[PDB]
Amino acid sequence: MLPHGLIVSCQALPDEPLHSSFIMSKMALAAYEGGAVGIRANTKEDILAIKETVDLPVIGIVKRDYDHSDVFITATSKEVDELIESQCEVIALDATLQQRPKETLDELVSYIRTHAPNVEIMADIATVEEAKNAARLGFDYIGTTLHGYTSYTQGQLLYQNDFQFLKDVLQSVDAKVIAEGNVITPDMYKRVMDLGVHCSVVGGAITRPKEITKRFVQIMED
Amino acid sequence: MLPHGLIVSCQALPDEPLHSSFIMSKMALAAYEGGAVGIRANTKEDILAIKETVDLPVIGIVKRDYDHSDVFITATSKEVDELIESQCEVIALDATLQQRPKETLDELVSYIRTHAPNVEIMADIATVEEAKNAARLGFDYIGTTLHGYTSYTQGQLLYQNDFQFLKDVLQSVDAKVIAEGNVITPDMYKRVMDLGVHCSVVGGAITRPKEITKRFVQIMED
Ligand SMILES: [Cl-]
Ligand SMILES: [Cl-]
């Protein structure tokens, strides 16, 4: 199981400065030495590289665009198969009811339970009712990952109105909730943990120096 | 580093019914599936078996009796060398002021820091002054393991006077404190965590069916 505490997302997509399975493995080692209790990683190759540097539990995803689908976080059984091969402790996937390229959410959950019975599953959701649906499907973890990053939640951010969306998710499900998306400061991390999330995923604020640099530069431009 | 939460001690000495590297590896798997954040294990053979079964961090010891010494938890460099080979994340040793068979406590600490710099060390102590001495030697974790199990702490037990000893250890050192020794109920586990220990080690109450059986039988004999 994932402990209580800080999960560090070690991701760099193509054309990002730190894009490299090797570099993400070193970012994961840094997070481990810093006192992270887990890693979130993208693609089989990054996950396998990370598993050579740290023994921390890994939340695995495959970000891959499909034609005629807005679902890109572990969209089909192809991505699930890669993550089963990766041996990541948790498989995370988009858990919205948006049109998928192949299998439905229900079919992907069943597929993982059948072919990988020792792996836990995490629902990346954008709405309270998506979180409720994920809890009903028996997801081990429910993340706020896609809140503000779907066409129907545009302009919304996790921290808005003292984390009201997170408070609503926590009240609606008894499953372990993960604060993920726009946790950019230790103060924000403390708040979501005090509100009663199981753990919190921090990415950009630790592993995206471009994003951190922009925050420093922006204070002078206000 | 060790997360916050429950560490399960999976030990069975030669005289015990479950004495087996294989059985202790399955006890460790059971602990992992139950939501343990770490394992405490005894001997290289048990540790290697556990570390091929689960990726949980392992606190390694070697219990071995020596002539003309009351120190038996990782007594000499021989035991330290076995634990270095085991690749356990944390090396625990008796951190009492008691004379050791070969190297002193101070010598063994220096030995581990030199020969295994990526390994954390845990002090099994009996007294507040031993906890303070462990902090002086730069121990990563300080456990209450030997409190009541030395010639100079006879009649003392961790839970006595609402864990007064644990309270005294916690306010004496800034290092991460581990509640270990006679933590035998969830109620005790909750209490020591509420008092602000980093984590707690539970052994016999989970992994010694003989000791659990005795507690069931004893309620009818009072
Ligand atoms: Cl970056
Ligand atoms: Cl037993």
Residue numbers in the entry:
A (entry chain A), B (entry chain B): 1 to 222
From the paper:
The third step in the sialic acid catabolic pathway is mediated by the enzyme N-acetylmannosamine-6-phosphate 2-epimerase (NanE), which catalyzes an inversion of stereochemistry at the C2 position of N-acetylmannosamine-6-phosphate (ManNAc-6P), yielding N-acetylglucosamine-6-phosphate (GlcNAc-6P). The crystal structure of NanE from Staphylococcus aureus, which comprises a triosephosphate isomerase barrel fold with an unusual dimeric architecture, was solved with both natural and modified substrates. NanE is essential for the growth of S. aureus in media containing N-acetylneuraminic acid as the sole carbon source and has a highly conserved active site across both Gram-positive and Gram-negative bacteria. Based on our structural and kinetic data, we propose that NanE performs its epimerization reaction using a novel proton displacement mechanism mediated by the substrate.
SaNanE crystallized with two monomers in the asymmetric unit. The monomeric structure of SaNanE is illustrated in Figure 2A (β-strands labeled i–viii and α-helices labeled A–H), showing that it assembles into a classic triosephosphate isomerase (TIM) barrel fold, with one exception: α-helix H does not pack against the β-barrel but instead mediates dimerization between the monomers. To further gauge the dynamics of the active-site residues, we conducted an ensemble refinement of the structure and again found that the active-site residues have low root-mean-square fluctuations and largely occupy a single conformation. In the apo structure, two active-site residues have side-chain moieties with significantly perturbed pKa values: Lys63 has a predicted pKa of 8.0, considerably lower than the pKa for lysine in water (10.4), whereas Glu180 has a predicted pKa of 7.1, which is considerably higher than the pKa for glutamic acid in water (4.5).
